[PDB]
Amino acid sequence: TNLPRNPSMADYEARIFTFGTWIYSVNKEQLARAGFYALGEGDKVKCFHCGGGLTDWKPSEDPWEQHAKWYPGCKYLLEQKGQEYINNIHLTHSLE
Amino acid sequence: TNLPRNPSMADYEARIFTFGTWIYSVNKEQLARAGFYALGEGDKVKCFHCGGGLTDWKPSEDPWEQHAKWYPGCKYLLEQKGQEYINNIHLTHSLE
Numbered sequence: 001t002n003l004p005r006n007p008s009m010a011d012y013e014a015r016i017f018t019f020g021t022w023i024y025s026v027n028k029e030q031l032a033r034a035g036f037y038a039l040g041e042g043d044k045v046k047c048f049h050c051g052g053g054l055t056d057w058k059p060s061e062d063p064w065e066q067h068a069k070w071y072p073g074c075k076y077l078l079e080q081k082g083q084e085y086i087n088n089i090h091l092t093h094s095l096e
Numbered sequence: 097t098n099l100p101r102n103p104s105m106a107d108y109e110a111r112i113f114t115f116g117t118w119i120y121s122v123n124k125e126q127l128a129r130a131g132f133y134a135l136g137e138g139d140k141v142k143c144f145h146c147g148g149g150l151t152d153w154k155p156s157e158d159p160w161e162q163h164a165k166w167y168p169g170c171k172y173l174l175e176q177k178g179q180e181y182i183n184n185i186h187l188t189h190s191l192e
């Protein structure tokens with residue numbers, strides 16, 4: 001079923017905690033909203049629910065947009081951002 | 097919000113009905129199961145939930161796969177098929 005991969009990190013306050021002095025430019029606070037947590041090797045992160053990992057962030061990129069871009073099938077994403085958002089970003093990423 | 101775009105076509109029996117002597121190659125049972133109904137022009141179909149239109153079907157195609165390939169945001173799709181399935185087809189598609 002659609003059960004989250006890491007239920008430990010389902011709680012927001014737990015995710016934000018993994019960014020313990022996070023040196024990279026992308027806003028840690030926003031990253032944890034989008035359902036990601038740090039790892040400890042580079043700027044690597046993962047969604048608690050879908051398990052999709054992202055790395056090498058440009059300065060002002062949006063975690064939500066990237067989450068949708070590469071991992072549109074996440075339930076946490078869908079509940080939080082919805083159908084239109086996800087499909088809209090997908091049909092944009094497509095045009096490349 | 098994740099409400100169905102066409103709740104009239106939420107029922108499978110409602111969907112299957114729209115394929116009144118369906119001439120085209122693709123299987124109508126599979127099409128309606130995948131959440132599609134016919135529009136009555138060509139082989140154009142839409143998904144009752146996400147509203148994603150698809151057309152010009154090839155003889156052997158899987159409606160579920162095309163649903164996922166093009167509209168990975170569908171709430172109906174996620175529930176029926178799962179995170180892993182959707183992300184998987186997206187990952188594959190991406191490299192084409």
Ligand SMILES: CCO[C@@H]1C[C@@H]2CN(C(=O)[C@@H](NC(=O)[C@H](C)NC)C3CCC(F)(F)CC3)[C@H](C(=O)N[C@@H]3CCOc4ccccc43)CN2C1
Nearest residue numbers: 044045046052053054055056057058061066070187190191
């Ligand atoms: C190849 C097809 O695979 C798809 C593409 C997408 C790229 N990506 C990425 O993280 C890409 N990052 C971004 O798009 C960032 C968020 N914006 C620029 C990077 C891919 C390598 C690069 F050199 F191009 C720098 C950008 C993710 C990625 O590579 N994640 C890695 C892969 C292995 O698993 C993990 C686990 C944890 C963290 C990261 C990853 C997911 N990828 C799937």
Ligand SMILES: CCO[C@@H]1C[C@@H]2CN(C(=O)[C@@H](NC(=O)[C@H](C)NC)C3CCC(F)(F)CC3)[C@H](C(=O)N[C@@H]3CCOc4ccccc43)CN2C1
Nearest residue numbers: 091094095140141142148149150151152153154157162166
């Ligand atoms: C550029 C970004 O747009 C994306 C691409 C994707 C392709 N597609 C399609 O339906 C494509 N069909 C398929 O992939 C079929 C299922 N397999 C070959 C065909 C588009 C026409 C074609 F002659 F080129 C043959 C492929 C769908 C499509 O064209 N749907 C149309 C768009 C307008 O709205 C409706 C409404 C009802 C039915 C179809 C559509 C969805 N598209 C979005």
Ligand SMILES: [Zn+2]
Nearest residue numbers: 047049050074
């Ligand atoms: Zn996710």
Ligand SMILES: [Zn+2]
Nearest residue numbers: 069089090093
């Ligand atoms: Zn996409």
Ligand SMILES: [Zn+2]
Nearest residue numbers: 143145146170
């Ligand atoms: Zn759909």
Ligand SMILES: [Zn+2]
Nearest residue numbers: 165185186189
């Ligand atoms: Zn895709």
